[PDB]
Design a protein around this ligand. Sequence first.
Ligand SMILES: Nc1nc2c(c(=O)[nH]1)N[C@H]1C(S)=C(S)[C@@H](COP(=O)(O)OP(=O)(O)OC[C@H]3O[C@@H](n4cnc5c(=O)[nH]c(N)nc54)[C@H](O)[C@@H]3O)O[C@H]1N2
Ligand SMILES: Nc1nc2c(c(=O)[nH]1)N[C@H]1C(S)=C(S)[C@@H](COP(=O)(O)OP(=O)(O)OC[C@H]3O[C@@H](n4cnc5c(=O)[nH]c(N)nc54)[C@H](O)[C@@H]3O)O[C@H]1N2
Ligand code: SF4
Ligand SMILES: [Mo]
Length: 720
Amino acid sequence: RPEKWVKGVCRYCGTGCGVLVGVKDGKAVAIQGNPNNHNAGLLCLKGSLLIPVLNSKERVTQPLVRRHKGGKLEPVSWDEALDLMASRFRSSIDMYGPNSVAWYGSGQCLTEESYVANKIFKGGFGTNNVDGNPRLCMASAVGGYVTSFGKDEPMGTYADIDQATCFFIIGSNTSEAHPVLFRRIARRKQVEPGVKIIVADPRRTNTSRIADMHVAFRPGTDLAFMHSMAWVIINEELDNPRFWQRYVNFMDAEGKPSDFEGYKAFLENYRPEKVAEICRVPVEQIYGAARAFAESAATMSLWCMGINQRVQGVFANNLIHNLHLITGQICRPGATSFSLTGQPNACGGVRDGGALSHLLPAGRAIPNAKHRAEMEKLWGLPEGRIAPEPGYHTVALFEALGRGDVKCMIICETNPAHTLPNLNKVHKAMSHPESFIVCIEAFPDAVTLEYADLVLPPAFWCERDGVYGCGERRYSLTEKAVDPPGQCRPTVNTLVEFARRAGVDPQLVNFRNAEDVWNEWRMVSKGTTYDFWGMTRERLRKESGLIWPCPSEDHPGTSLRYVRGQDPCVPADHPDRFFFYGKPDGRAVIWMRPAKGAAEEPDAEYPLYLTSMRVIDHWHTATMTGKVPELQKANPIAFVEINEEDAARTGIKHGDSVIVETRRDAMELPARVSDVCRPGLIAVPFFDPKKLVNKLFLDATDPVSREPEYKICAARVRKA
Ligand SMILES: Nc1nc2c(c(=O)[nH]1)N[C@H]1C(S)=C(S)[C@@H](COP(=O)(O)OP(=O)(O)OC[C@H]3O[C@@H](n4cnc5c(=O)[nH]c(N)nc54)[C@H](O)[C@@H]3O)O[C@H]1N2
Ligand SMILES: Nc1nc2c(c(=O)[nH]1)N[C@H]1C(S)=C(S)[C@@H](COP(=O)(O)OP(=O)(O)OC[C@H]3O[C@@H](n4cnc5c(=O)[nH]c(N)nc54)[C@H](O)[C@@H]3O)O[C@H]1N2
Ligand code: SF4
Ligand SMILES: [Mo]
């Protein structure tokens, strides 16, 4: 029975549910949803079963070191570990320059931890080799928002779910991936049965059971589909000229200035009857989706990896925004283009904090000299300290590691040997005989540890305080509830000490705790369109999150970005009601992106599309949810989804052990025959360690966002 309730944030998905941890003095005994956060006291099963994870004894509790490659990992002193880390890094820089070292973090790191590691590597060591797992996830969405709007992050919030009359949910298994959000959507349609829901996804998931229409298009053909929708919208005069004539600019297929007539001319290449067959769907779906979208009083789009993990990821994102831009379904309650963020802090930590290889904090960019100067000034650095060239993006980083270009790397709160694409190649790279890899990891079963040279024990989740920035621009504090076990220390501290010992000027890592970094980061944001200066620690302790922009302590936060009278970044006296200030002329942009396909399409030899997806019970690599026995009762191990019509003709029965094979590897999996995967598609989950499916997937990335195409590759199947 709890004596105190410590306010936090769920450790899992980007829905970012507020949580209250009940501690019976010393130990966490219960957990309940924070009634004051957006989730209003509700949590899904994974969140509900957080305590068994926090109290698990199967943790990394003391530093470990592997004296030599291929050898046993053994205990080592914290002091001996920090000196080892600092000497190896400093030497590498002294010998080969900053670009020989790198930081590979994640959207699961507290904002404060990502900010510190970013600053160390960029302002301290002078290398921009700072990336993270959000590159495997939200990079395409960032690209989409910056190219369409000139600023990252959604312009709306979760609250828009309550006023939308239409939901266009594409490339998102919302029920299994953002449970609390799916419930809020299902609730909306229950309160108002008139609400229409279109679910576009090659797979028929539980998300489609509340859908008015399920568009099961051929993998990769959604750009054609969405262009077709705009064709219909224009053709049936369902567009909003009063809006686009005043707030939109058009760009042709070659990226040059164009106009409405050019948009119409381009769209002629995407007529419904032609696209319906490209997409392998009934032509009525194109008309229906378009009409529901444009005729509705307020439409909201929501999408996830099915859109982002694509070589055309940034373009697919632009197409979704085009729909809202041509119809004016934006900047009003219930109407917005809402990218769903997968991780708890891919937003606050990596995106907003600029902890990616080409970024600087608060929407600054490495290639921009005024930005580099601005940062050198804020961080008290000597002119020119920040390298002008962006560092390696994730896939390139592990490639550099495999070549010996990157000799020292810190992997923190991610499991790359399990989750990076094209594993066989990645494993070879991580096995470089002369590399020095330091893993900050909470659970010993993470496969990446088999590659680590030094393992450091971190304080897990609420064992320390920190901020998480979820998908709706909401910044929420998680206060420390219990003490870290064994020798576990807060990564914020471990970083500050690693820096000092590595030679970094002490004025740079001038932090005792997370609150100290929050105050500097608060300063670094001041004046920018991210400005969250009003989010003091005290306000964050008392509030269940605040949504930025939040400039002064007396400012309530912002739900409607780009809207006069709502967004503080839009002059009180701006002449127009909307202002897309991320663009020089205040106008958003519609892009006539040509629809292509996957990097590796099916052919004679490998006739099927292979996709990979989430399952509600398991969180990623399962080093955390794998400790909760209840979560293992439905899908204990991996399987391969095969379509009914394909199985029959292929001669495969349900339960059969089948070999899924791509050009990169073959893996045996039990077949799960159903109508989930449309014909010509198979799907594998990645939660099982004994079945590392990323060994099957290709390594191609969107040339702009550099996000890998985990969603599509070519395969062949056979009975084992
Ligand atoms: N239980 C649980 N929840 C999670 C996670 C977890 O590990 N476990 N992860 C969190 C994280 S990091 C993230 S990024 C989110 C992501 O969550 P989602 O992206 O919603 O989950 P996925 O299974 O990857 O869903 C992608 C969907 O894209 C489909 N798809 C495949 N090919 C295409 C295509 O060509 N076009 C389109 N439009 N769709 C396509 C798939 O069939 C699948 O249904 O989930 C979050 N939620
Ligand atoms: N085929 C395929 N591959 C994919 C995807 C896909 O859809 N298909 N999705 C991709 C996407 S969106 C993502 S987000 C990535 C994510 O994939 P990863 O980030 O690699 O997966 P996680 O299991 O979340 O890794 C987090 C690690 O943090 C550890 N950890 C937990 N708490 C702490 C802590 O406090 N400190 C430290 N140091 N470690 C801690 C865990 O034990 C675990 O090893 O996977 C990607 N890979
Ligand atoms: S919906 Fe996401 S943030 Fe909310 S309790 Fe579930 S896993 Fe946690
Ligand atoms: Mo993600």
